[PDB]
Amino acid sequence: LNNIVSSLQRNGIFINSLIAALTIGGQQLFSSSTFSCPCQVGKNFYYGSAFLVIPALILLVAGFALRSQMWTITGEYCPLECKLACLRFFSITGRAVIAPLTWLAVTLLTGTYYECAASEFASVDHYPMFDNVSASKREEILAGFPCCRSAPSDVILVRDEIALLHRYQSQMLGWILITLATIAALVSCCVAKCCSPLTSLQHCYWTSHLQNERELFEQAAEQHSRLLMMHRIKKLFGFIPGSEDVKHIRIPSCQDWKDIS
Amino acid sequence: LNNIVSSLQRNGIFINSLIAALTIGGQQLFSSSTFSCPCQVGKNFYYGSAFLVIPALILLVAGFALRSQMWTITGEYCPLECKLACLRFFSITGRAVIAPLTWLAVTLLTGTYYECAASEFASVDHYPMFDNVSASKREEILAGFPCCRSAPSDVILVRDEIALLHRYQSQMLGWILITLATIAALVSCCVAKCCSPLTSLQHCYWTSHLQNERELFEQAAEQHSRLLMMHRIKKLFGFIPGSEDVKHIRIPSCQDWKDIS
Amino acid sequence: LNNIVSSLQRNGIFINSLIAALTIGGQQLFSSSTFSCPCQVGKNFYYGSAFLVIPALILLVAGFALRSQMWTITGEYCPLECKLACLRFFSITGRAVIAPLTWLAVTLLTGTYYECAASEFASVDHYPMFDNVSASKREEILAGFPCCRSAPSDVILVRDEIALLHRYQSQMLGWILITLATIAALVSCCVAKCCSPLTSLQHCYWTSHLQNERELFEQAAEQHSRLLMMHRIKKLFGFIPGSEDVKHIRIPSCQDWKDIS
Amino acid sequence: LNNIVSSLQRNGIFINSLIAALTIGGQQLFSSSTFSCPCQVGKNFYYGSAFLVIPALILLVAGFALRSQMWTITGEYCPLECKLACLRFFSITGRAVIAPLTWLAVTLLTGTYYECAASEFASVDHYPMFDNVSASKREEILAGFPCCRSAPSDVILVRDEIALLHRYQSQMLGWILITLATIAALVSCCVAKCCSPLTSLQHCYWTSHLQNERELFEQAAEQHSRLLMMHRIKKLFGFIPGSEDVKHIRIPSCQDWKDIS
Amino acid sequence: LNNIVSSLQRNGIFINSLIAALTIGGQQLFSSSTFSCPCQVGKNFYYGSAFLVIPALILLVAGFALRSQMWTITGEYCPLECKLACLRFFSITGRAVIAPLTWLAVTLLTGTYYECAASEFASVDHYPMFDNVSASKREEILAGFPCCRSAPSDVILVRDEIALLHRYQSQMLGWILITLATIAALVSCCVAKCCSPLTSLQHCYWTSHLQNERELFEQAAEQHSRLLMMHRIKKLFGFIPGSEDVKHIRIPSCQDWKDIS
Amino acid sequence: LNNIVSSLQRNGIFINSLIAALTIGGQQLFSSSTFSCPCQVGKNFYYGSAFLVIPALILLVAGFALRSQMWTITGEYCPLECKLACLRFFSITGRAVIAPLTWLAVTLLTGTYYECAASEFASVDHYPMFDNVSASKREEILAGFPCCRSAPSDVILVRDEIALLHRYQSQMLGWILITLATIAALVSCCVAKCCSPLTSLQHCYWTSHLQNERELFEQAAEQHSRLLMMHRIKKLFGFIPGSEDVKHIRIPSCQDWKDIS
Amino acid sequence: LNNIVSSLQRNGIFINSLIAALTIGGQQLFSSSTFSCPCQVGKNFYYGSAFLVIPALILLVAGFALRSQMWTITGEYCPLECKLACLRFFSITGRAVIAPLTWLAVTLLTGTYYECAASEFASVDHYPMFDNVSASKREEILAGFPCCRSAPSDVILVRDEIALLHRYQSQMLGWILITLATIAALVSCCVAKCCSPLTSLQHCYWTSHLQNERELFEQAAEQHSRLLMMHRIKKLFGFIPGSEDVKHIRIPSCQDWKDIS
């Protein structure tokens, strides 16, 4: 049933779902463990922006780089060959895109990252309580109350209202992002089908050709080197390894020990 | 017994039930985790409408796109051929429809999404407490009390009455939607049977023909490419992989290394 | 022992019991989760009537439609042929009837659905407390107290008495319904036996004939199409798939790639 | 060991015990869940009588109807043939009787059903507290206090005494019923043995003859129809299903597609 | 399935992930157990710097040294040979780098190590509370309050603000470090591909050649020495070990006991 | 899979990790159970020094002695032979060093042993509270407060400060020790590779030669003695043990009983 | 894998570790259960001395006696024979020494046994509180307070100080004992290697010779007696046991019954 399991894995839906589930679980643990939104007035946008974009960028780069087909494409690039390379790049891009989109969607829908990032950019014209002719303390309290200030001094109404505003903006932005991602994925698949010179059956043949040629060469390269080394050590020790050699044995010489080395 | 399990899966009832159960569980977790109905006076209908329709639209698109038969139909379209394509589209539409209908039904029956969406569209003529000659504060409180306002000031009677009204309207709308979906499904199946030119036995033969032809070509395309590459690497290394080659081995040349590449 | 398990399933008693148990469990979860009886004076009968009849109607339609034998009967209909079709319809009707009868029986015996449905149709002549010369407030309170009003103002005695009256009427109606269903089932089986032209042994032979003919044609249609496609692709690639083809291989031409497509 | 398990099931004691245990468990759940004895003065005897007799009648009818041997007997009826049919009817009646007797015994021994049924028929001559010259309020309170009235007004002594009287009468009636059932079962078995024209060994032979003839005809009817349809589809597709057919294949014609249909 | 498991391990992604997970778990236990940040005014930077860099340096050295290929490269070093050695060094550097980068990233993101390290380097110009004309007590309290001082004397506002500043700086530094590590890894892989004289297929052949030659020589060196010693002890005891020797046995002499020793 | 498990054990990393883990667990149990730091003014340095060095010395001696290769080296010692013995000593020293280094590192990092050892050597010039012109009570209290004195008399500030000083010194000393151990291990491995006259492949051959020669001689010494004794007892009892001897049996004589003894 | 398990047991390290672990567990249970240090002024040293030395002496005697090789050595004793007997005695002494050393080490390190043993030998010159011109009550209280006296009368400071003194002395004595035991074991092994006339390989041969000769004689003595008795009873009953004897049977005579007895 292992072969049946492998056939099931050959479908990209299961693997992409598994990657998305791992991203969701990892994001839950990571955010609930080590977020600790700072209260710093000077630089607080960088904290949220890093916590929101850097993991997505890392996951994107990992999804692209960890695929050996991408290294082969880059080696080829560094007519029909161009279209074939573009098709392989698209096939890689499927996973390379499902990897970080889950992170961005989950983080935006939770909204805490976006809140901690864009808290300080809130407006104060609507709220008469934020006059603050000093024009410097207002910025500090604006960047301060989202984090840990608490301190109920009847300003918490404005805090709660603006926090709900930023949470709503975050979740709506997440929905916009996921809708755009889905539309882009569908359009990209349609463009790949339209621009592919190979027919559907020819495309299937070519994909299987690529997979099988790579696997076959790997296996037979292993077997060829095994045979060549086995002949070499047959010369070295007077027998082929793993076979009945009580007939004859060899005594290597020091210069022969140099030759094998 | 794995073959028996596969035969059971071949029935669409089990798979559709599994999809519906996953949709119900996912909706429960998603709604109980990250709903957080906003209190914003300006845009609150968009929040509920997005949370109610966007997941359904995404699930519909996923159900249609993830089926490779749909890509084959679109490739063909892009007499009897038209009817056959329509029949295959209907067979895909079965799953493509069971996927989001569960989401819409569960969300409407729970009613919280519809409440948060259409709270602000409530009438005030019936209730004398909502005179509010200002005609602007009334809209804000109307969009505000459903979310988190609480603040018992004896208006909570009107809040509770209108909340029950919207919940009842939501659940009745859900029942109307599921009844219409069932009627449409039954009528569509009857129309498919009436409009199908193939006989019942001929239809069964054609369906099995399609499945078997696709599977057979996939397998033998794999095997043909395996044989062709195996002959190529037999030329390359002087032996066929996976067989007894102690008779002879090859030493590839650099230009030959270019040819295999 | 899998074959023994299949033989046990061939008895309709186990499958009908399994369907009834699933209906009971689903009704328990559904009602205990999302009933929320409304307090609306205008339309409250529709709520309960929908929650009581719509699931039963959906389950009835599903039981009839999900059976492929029903599609075959409808295709035939759209002498002895009429009686044979009627017998097959009855065999389908067995499951199509056990599916929703469990829902109706459980919902009526619990009585909450019937209470929320027919609360507003209660009489007030017996109770002197419901004079209400206004003749409009009385209807509203009558439709209101069953839901969530509570508000002990010594009218709860009338509320409790009428609630017990409606609960008793609901459970007695459920018993009447289940008794009528059992009597109708027994009479229908007796009428089927009386009206069947086939003898008992002939009826058994005919039933097994139908099942076996459908299964055999499905299997051999699969195998015939497999053989035809296998010959086609033998023409295409110069070999039969899944067999030793190191003797010869083919190089398809583009026009031949068109022919296979 | 599955065959040994089947041999154990062939003994009626285990199956009858299993049916009785299921009846006891189902009665426990059903009564502890949805009894809710009403307080209605007018009709309260019908409630208990239905809850006490209707399930027993349904179980009796199910036990008789679900046995296919009963349908065969009814088909025969609709000399020695009469005695043989009577013997088969008795063999069916064994299970048809053990099915509801458990329900009646358990319900009477618990006594709550009988109490709620025959509460209103209690006498009042013994108790001087029930003078009630009105002669209408007395009936209402008599039918009311058993259900949920509580309301300790020092009449609860009479309530408790009459409740104990009805509980004792219920349990004694249950013992009378089970004793009569056992005596009737033993006498019926003795009468069956006396009136049976077959000898003991001949009776065993006849019972096994009946079982084996029915099973054999079912199996070979299946196999005969399989062979006939297999020959038909051999004509249709030019080969027998499930066998090596690479020698020849057929191309059905539309009129031939009509003939197979 | 053990062979399949080995094939999965052959992918570096799983092993690198396993190493990173072990580093994370070990860091969690180690830091939560035995950190105990000191309060010493004189030397407190050394404590955090050691706890932050020494484990990373040890893990780096272990990753490089524990790989026997590194010992082989160092033995060779102590044209194309240089490039081949550089490629092998890079292949080792992959694991040698994933080993401590996890430690540095986790420790910086947690931030406690960096806080305890660079607490004393905080500025005091911004805070008017830290005038301290003594200019020596200020340094001591600055190095003291992060550790365990507590002692709320309304200076804890400055403590909390500067602690948040250092935590934010630590986490941002961790993000900078991980981004630089990823960029360096990608650039190094690209430079390795560009500078490699071998082709992609030739590179695969060479890697498999190296692995197979080392494994083959290890095995056959074992077998050669086994044969040589077996012949020696055949001389010693008059028979080959592990074979039927009831034909003849030997009695070793003391001088022969010296020869074997 | 047992052979695969043995191959995994052949790697020293797993065994060294297992030894270190056992040392950590044993140290945890031992220290948390039976430390009980004394308060004795006279001799308290000896207690901590013993608890810190004696287990390490015992583990070092056990690691060296328990290896039979060490006994063989000592027997040889008691040109190339010297270098070969040095290489074998180094191979033993690997485990002999990983055994106690874990104990020293864990004990120093915990710091309690070092605190109890070097408490009395603390300075008193910095602290004006320790004037104590008596110059004898001061030493006693200095050696006393670390253990169990408690007794808060506002001197606990000095106690806590000096305890933190000694804990920091202990952990820094542990880091210095582990860094020096790692540097020494790496330098020793490099010196072993540089000073080894054998080539890398020759070194592998020699190591496998040593292991195989020892194992082979052990096995065949067992088999030779088994054969010799078996012949002796064949003389004694007239038959070879474990074979069909119903042909003949012997009756030993008393003088023959002496000869076998 | 049982043979592999036996090979692992053949290493003395595992068995000695198992013996030490059992000694530790048994000591824990025994001491925590039934110590109950007495308060008797007269004889309290004997109690602790017995509880500390008698189990060690018993374990030593058991380790020596339970080994049958020791009985063989004593039988031989009761040139090279002397050295061989000494070597076998040393091999026995390994286990005979690891058996009680664990008990002594654990008991001394816990220190409770030594405290209860040597409490009464404490000095009183240092403590001015123990003047007690009576010179008899002082001894009684000195032997009394360690056990159960409690009775805080401000003398508990001296009690605690002297208890810590004796605990420290006990644990230091335990460390001295274990260090001396390890040094003696290493020196004894070195002396055994130096004084052994056999070479290392000859020593291995001799050890295996001893084990194999004893096992072989045991087995074949069993088989010889089985054959002799089997022939005897073949004479007795006319057949060999466990074989086909339907050919002939015997009827033993009473005098023959005497001969077999």
Author numbering:
A (entry chain F), B (entry chain E), C (entry chain D), D (entry chain C), E (entry chain G), F (entry chain H), ...: 5 to 82, 94 to 276
Extract from the study:
The calcium homeostasis modulators (CALHM) constitute one family of large pore channels that contains six members in humans. Although sharing the same number of membrane-spanning segments, their arrangement is unique and differs from other large pore channels, with an extended helix located on the C-terminus and forming the core of a cytoplasmic domain further mediating subunit interactions. In oligomeric channels, the pore is lined by the first transmembrane segment (TM1) of each subunit, which forms an inner, of two concentric rings, with the outer ring being constituted by TM2-4, with TM2 and 4 of neighboring subunits engaging in extended interactions. Here, we investigated whether these placental paralogs would form heteromers and characterized heteromeric complexes consisting of CALHM2 and CALHM4 subunits using specific binders as fiducial markers.
Dimerization in CALHM4 proceeds at its intracellular region, resulting in large particles, which expose their extracellular parts at both ends of a tubular assembly. This sample has allowed us to isolate a specific binder, termed SbCALHM4 or short SbC4, that forms a tight complex with the CALHM4 channel pair, which remains intact during size exclusion chromatography as confirmed by SDS-PAGE. When investigated by cryo-EM, we observed two populations of particles either exhibiting D10 or D11 symmetry (corresponding to dimers of decameric and undecameric channels) that closely resemble equivalent structures of CALHM4 determined in previous studies. Between the two populations, the reconstruction of the density with D10 symmetry imposed was of higher resolution and we thus restrict our detailed analysis to this structure. Each subunit contains four membrane-spanning helices, three of which (TM2-4) are tightly interacting to form an outer ring with a large diameter that separates the inside of the pore from its surrounding membrane environment. In contrast, TM1 forms an inner ring of helices lining the pore, with the bent helical N-terminus (NH) running perpendicular to the membrane and projecting towards the pore axis. TM1 packs against TM3 of the outer ring but is not involved in direct subunit interactions. Within each channel, we find residual density of low resolution, whose distribution resembles the headgroup region of a lipid bilayer, which was thus previously ascribed to a membrane assembled in the lumen of the pore. In this cryo-EM map, we find the density of sybodies binding at the extracellular side of each subunit forming two rings of binders at both ends of the assembly.
